Design a protein around this ligand. Sequence first.
Ligand code: MA4
Ligand code: CZ6
Ligand code: CB4
Length: 265
Amino acid sequence: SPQPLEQIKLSESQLSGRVGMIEMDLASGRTLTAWRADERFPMMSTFKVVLCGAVLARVDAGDEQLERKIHYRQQDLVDYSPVSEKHLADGMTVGELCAAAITMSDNSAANLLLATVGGPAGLTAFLRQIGDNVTRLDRWETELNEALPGDARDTTTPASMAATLRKLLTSQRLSARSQRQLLQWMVDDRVAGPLIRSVLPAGWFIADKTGAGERGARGIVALLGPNNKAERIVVIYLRDTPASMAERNQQIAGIGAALIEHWQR
Ligand SMILES: OC[C@H]1O[C@H](O[C@H]2[C@H](O)[C@@H](O)[C@H](OCCCCCCC3CCCCC3)O[C@@H]2CO)[C@H](O)[C@@H](O)[C@@H]1O
Ligand SMILES: C[C@H]1CC(C)(C)OB(CNC(=O)/C(=N\OC(C)(C)C(=O)O)c2csc(N)n2)O1
Ligand SMILES: CC(C)(O/N=C(\C(=O)NCB(O)O)c1csc(N)n1)C(=O)O
């Protein structure tokens, strides 16, 4: 495969869209490589990881419990709720909701959790508290996927998203158990995880959350490394391309392949 930036250029040329990318050491925050890493992209469903970071923060503070059962109504549901639509009778625990939000991309699960942290405004306040002055959530599922050009709503940058994920996973802002839990949920992704793992070379650790939006928007936040270690955070976003979903997936895959083949020490 081409060198990562070579591949990214080919991708933008072929898609007529923008790509944003960063690869960053999990432990130290050392940036290995980056492209448009300070440009804004819609987070889409990638925000679900940050959301559950916020939820875990509330658990650590004694404001919430992963065990707490939330009961909700059919009228609370939005588009794409494969897990949550199954539990109108019995409800779901906060932890179960995070699991459904991260591992199945369940939108109503996400909205229910979003309510517990003070809505988009509350999640944005949480981001500011952990020193992310860039990322912002403004809407709920599914409006937050609108991806209007020039709209700052519901956006991050690759560099801010990677820094924030690192903060959530390793900085001891969250408790030891909470850090472990957030990791677990990403390891357990059911949307793309098993497929990615199936096509990764042997020895490569994967944990991830994907996202998709309008106008071609597509993305992934991932923990990746050789030697079965979560060595690095990789963020790849795509925006403003008329291309097929198949082509968007393949391009992100080819950028991933480039990063893997050309992994530096
Ligand atoms: O020489 C290095 C490697 O090159 C290839 O491996 C390929 C593999 O055959 C392909 O299937 C994968 O696709 C990448 C997997 C796509 C998954 C999506 C990408 C995600 C991953 C997490 C962050 C970025 C986005 O690329 C690697 C690297 O070229 C060879 O098949 C393999 O034997 C060899 O060890
Ligand atoms: C993820 C972050 C999001 C956010 C919103 C930054 O705050 B925290 C933690 N703090 C609170 O949730 C909180 N009240 O919690 C209870 C109700 C327990 C209380 O102490 O009264 C609160 C925040 S602003 C306001 N007026 N009240 O979670
Ligand atoms: C699984 C996938 C593509 O997300 N799929 C969604 C969806 O609504 N995602 C919202 B997120 O990108 O804010 C969806 C709606 S109807 C349908 N089918 N899928 C993702 O998160 O990657």
